[PDB]
């Protein structure tokens, strides 16, 4: 058989396996996945609705939080789930077809599908409640989201390859992921951030991607000076190149 057809076979096999293990069997995890964004909205909107109305009166808070959260949740999942991909499937790593790249690709596909479903559900719910839920510019939003996908998957593969040993180091991944929820422009607009903190704030590619996605979503949204797509695109490209090279070096050392 060709490598391509056996590739579809093995990726379909690990995709259904990963759906089985993540969904709990009885399809109970969908409630958790659906409930985290709405719980985040319910916590988030009860203290800063008035502050946001003072800041940006033309933009509704819930749609702003949908566009700020769901891409960030998708990126966080793409990092976390793919980082710990090798250890979960360790017991079945000797079938001559179950190389780790297939496992990380299957996890990435599963997470992309799940979060895209959640995105569609959230947009439909927002439209059902009388909010604004059609992006004025669609395919630029799709391109920014694709850049986010490439960056997140690349970072996840890089961390999975680098930290095959010393799993304690995985901690300083997820513990470091929690500040990224606050520093990036997810829950509150970065318009209110004082400019003297602005330069270091520009070092976050996720902030650039979130701001560009929001700009492509809403009509007449202003971008800050220094926000661009070139920096996060180059970050994603370099990280993907580094991750692929590092996996190619240590390809044979991820079997036991």
């Amino acid at each position: 058989r060709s490598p391509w057809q056996i590739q579809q076979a093995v990726l379909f096999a690990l995709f259904l396996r990963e759906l089985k293990t993540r969904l709990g069997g009885r399809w109970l995890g969908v409630f958790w996945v659906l409930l985290e964004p709405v719980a985040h909205i319910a916590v988030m909107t009860t203290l800063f609705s008035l502050a946001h109305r003072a800041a940006m009166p033309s933009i509704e808070y819930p749609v702003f939080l949908i566009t700020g959260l769901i891409p960030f949740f998708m990126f966080r999942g793409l990092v976390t789930r793919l980082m710990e991909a090798i250890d979960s499937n360790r017991g079945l790593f000797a079938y001559r077809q179950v190389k780790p790249i297939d496992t990380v690709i299957a996890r990435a596909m599963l997470e992309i599908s799940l979060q895209s479903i959640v995105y569609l559900i959230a947009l439909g719910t927002l439209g059902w409640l009388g909010f604004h839920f059609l992006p004025v510019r669609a395919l630029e939003l799709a391109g920014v989201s694709a850049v986010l996908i490439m960056l997140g998957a690349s970072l996840g593969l890089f961390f999975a390859v680098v930290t095959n040993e010393i799993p304690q180091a995985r901690a300083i991944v997820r513990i470091s992921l929690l500040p990224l929820y606050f520093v990036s422009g997810v829950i509150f607009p970065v318009h209110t951030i004082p400019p003297q903190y602005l330069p270091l704030l520009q070092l976050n590619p996720v902030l650039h991607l979130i701001e560009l996605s929001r700009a492509s979503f809403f009509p007449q949204y202003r971008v800050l000076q220094g926000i661009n797509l070139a920096y996060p695109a180059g970050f994603a490209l370099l990280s993907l190149f580094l991750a692929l090279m590092l996996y190619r070096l240590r390809r044979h050392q991820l079997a036991s």
């Binding site: 009885r26 399809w27 109970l28 409630f31 059902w128």
Partner: peptide, 29 residues
């Protein structure tokens, strides 16, 4: 808004059917 109320009632009823079916499936075993 008869169609609107009917559709949202369908959504909530299906959601409650799903949650009660999940609860029943968990407690049967």
């Amino acid at each position: 808004r008869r169609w609107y109320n009917l559709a949202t009632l369908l959504v909530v009823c299906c959601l409650i059917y799903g949650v009660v079916s999940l609860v029943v499936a968990t407690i049967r075993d």
